[PDB]
Amino acid sequence: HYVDWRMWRDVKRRKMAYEYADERLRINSLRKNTILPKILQDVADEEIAALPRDSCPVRIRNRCVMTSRPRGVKRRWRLSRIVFRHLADHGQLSGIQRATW
């Protein structure tokens, strides 16, 4: 019942990235060093690259939770500039007022 399929695909991505977060963390530690042998680091480069694509955190997009807008999103409220203003202009956001100086 999400806004659109683009939103639904990001929900799945955030779920798969939460399951492999530890497995990816432990493998990257091996790659991010000059201590272990190159032979071992080469095997970890193939193990983390064989994990599903949607497990990668860079493929996540901070969309608006009300409209699924990919751009123009405020991270503190997780809303788009259009929805944020609609609530702020009606006095529904605590403390938010218009600036004049």
């Binding site: 203003r85 605590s94 403390g95 007022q97």
Partner: protein, 138 residues
């Protein structure tokens, strides 16, 4: 004419363990409205005087966080809207308290903390040197 002939009071047992000491008790309340803080100050100061507590009040400088957004849904870059959140502060510096007195005063004012008002309570406790620190072992 109708009044409870006898009243029941909550039991306050005295423990054998010693009580905690507090050199200072700093209470920092935030808010978007200044009169709500001027009114909470009057309540917290008067509640300290009746309990026999030393209190000092000062007003830290405010903070204003601003940000701008596009006015239109499409194009018209030049035209934008600017917003702000104003955070006002009020610090209540108490001194020379005990664990029990602070436990009571804080509960009294924390419960009556009005809407839109947060609090950061910094507690400065007095301790004594541990046993291992008295003399060296080597």
């Amino acid at each position: 004419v109708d009044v409870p002939k006898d009243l029941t009071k909550p039991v306050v047992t005295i423990s054998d363990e010693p009580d905690i000491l507090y050199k200072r008790l700093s209470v920092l309340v935030k808010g978007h409205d200044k009169a709500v803080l001027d009114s909470y100050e009057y309540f917290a100061v008067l509640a300290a005087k009746e309990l026999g507590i030393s209190i000092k009040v000062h007003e830290p400088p405010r903070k204003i966080e601003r940000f701008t957004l596009l006015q239109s849904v499409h194009i018209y870059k030049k035209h934008r809207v600017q917003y702000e959140m104003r955070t006002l502060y009020r610090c209540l510096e108490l001194e020379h308290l005990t664990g029990s007195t602070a436990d009571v005063y804080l509960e009294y004012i924390q419960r009556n903390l009005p809407e839109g008002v947060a609090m950061e309570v910094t507690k400065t406790q007095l301790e004594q040197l541990p046993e291992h620190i008295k003399e060296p072992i080597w």
